[PDB]
Amino acid sequence: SSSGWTAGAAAYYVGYLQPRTFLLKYNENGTITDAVDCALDPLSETKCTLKSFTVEKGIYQTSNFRVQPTESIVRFPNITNLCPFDEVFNATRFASVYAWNRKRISNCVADYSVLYNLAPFFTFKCYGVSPTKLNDLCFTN
Amino acid sequence: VYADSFVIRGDEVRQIAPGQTGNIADYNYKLPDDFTGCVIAWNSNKLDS
Amino acid sequence: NFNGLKGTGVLTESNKKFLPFQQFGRDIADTTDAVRDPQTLEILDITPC
Amino acid sequence: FSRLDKVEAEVQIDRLITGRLQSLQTYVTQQLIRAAEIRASANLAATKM
Amino acid sequence: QMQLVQSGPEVKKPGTSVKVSCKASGFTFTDVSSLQWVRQARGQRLEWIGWTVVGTGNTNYAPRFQERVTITTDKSTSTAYMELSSLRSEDTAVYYCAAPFCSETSCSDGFDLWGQGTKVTVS
Question: Structurally, how many domains does chain E consist of?
């Protein structure tokens, strides 16, 4: 009853999908009737290149040959000085427009997320570099 | 057509744009790189507060 | 004007067989040349003047 | 791609694809000219023989 | 370097209020870093006061210092404050804040950063 069960005969098959490029054939009625892969055999590869289901005798040029990278390496200076951004912005006095002061920032690690933190910095639009990609660049001054 | 409704802080409304990264676009709600449709956001400090 | 699909041409009844999940047709130039009228579901045909 | 986001990077990248795609077309065209005057000289040496 | 600095010693009259704060240099408290406060007298052992989580904001206090001490955290400068009232003679001791380094992913199960403490006295 509630424990155990008897069933009939059956079989089921499981396969996994994979990114592939195919070439499909539509007949006059609008239904797919045949298909050829493009990464199974060199013959299928040249069939896929020529856009035909049959190829004539000869020599054919197909896709190129390249070697893929194995590991990724990044080299950056090791300074970690946390550039003094707060001094410029949290100052208690700014000079007049005709005598604007210029401060120089160098030899430190610059984080622009703390800039992004405060809400009143509403007008933040940039010309040569996108404002959301400042953390992956190195600047000379 | 389908609509998503939620209430967030006023500061983080700018992170709902596609491609933006931050606190709310990483762990709570993310939009795909290609997007069709658009968003609406109006201040409501009289109901929830 | 078929559901926002604008164009120009003469329309004739066609004998194509559209599967239930299909609505539009296409050619080698990727331009619509067969539609189903919404209200009444006959299959039309589009050719330029 | 390492200095601009996706929304104005396509304006710059397209300006460079068509530029480089036009220097290849120019190179191919000159070869068609040159190959048609070497052939006019290979039909003269085939007659002298 | 990445390190935690502490304020200086001070003398405060009894029956008043005392504020203590310790700073961080080249080090941010992000959302996972936590810190505790301890007190060391002269020729005595160590007694734990409380530790708070920067992210959630949960605070814990010793039962005997339930009202005496209040601990608060600050994200803008990434620091910790204590407020105490009506200090007694036994409070003349050195106060330390200790935290483990932690960067948004994971961190050690022990407190390895330390300050040098503030020597607070009552006269």
Answer: 1
Q: What are phi and psi of E53, to 5 degrees?
A: -100, 130
CB A62 within 8 A of CB A90: no
Q: Are A132 and B20 inside 8 Å of each other by CB?
A: yes
- The closest of A87, A85, A38, A80 to A63, measured between CA atoms, is A38
Method by which the coordinates were obtained = cryo-EM
Do the chains contact at D5 and B33, CB–CB below 8 Å?
A: no
Specify the amino acid at residue A45: E
Nearest residue of B to residue D5, measured between CA atoms: B19
Nearest residue in chain E measured CA to CA from A83? E26
- Number of Cβ atoms within 10 Å of the Cβ of A130: 16
Distance CA E68, CA E47 (A): 15
Task: Indicate the pairing of strand E10-12 with strand E118-122.
Answer: parallel
Short-list E117, E123, E118, CA closest to E89: E123
Amino acid letter, residue A1: S
Q: Looking at beta carbons, which residues of chain E come within 8 Å of A81?
A: 26
CA-nearest residue to B33 within chain D is D6
Q: What are the residues whose beta carbons fall under 8 Å from the beta carbon of B41, sequence distance 6 or more?
A: B13, B16
Q: Do E2 and A81 touch (CB under 8 A)?
A: no
Instruction: Find where tokens 């080249």 sit.
Output: E26
Count CB neighbours of E101 within 10 A: 15
Q: Which two tokens stand for residue C21?
A: 């999940």
Distance to chain C for A45, nearest Cα, Å: 22
CA distance E22 to B12: 30
Choose among C27, E77, D33: nearest CA to A114.
E77
CA distance B37 to chain A (A): 23
Q: Does B49 touch chain A if contact means CB atoms closer than 8 Å?
A: no
Q: How far apart are CA A17 and CA E33, in angstroms?
A: 43
**Do A and D share at least 3 CB pairs under 8 Å?**
yes
* CATH number, domain with residue E106: 2.60.40.10
Q: Domain of E51? A: 3-122
Cβ-based neighbour number of residue E113 at 10 Å: 16
Q: Where are the alpha helices (DSSP H) in chain A?
A: 42-50, 85-89, 113-117
Token pair in block for residue D8: 């104005």
Rounded Cα gap, residues A128 and A116, in angstroms = 18
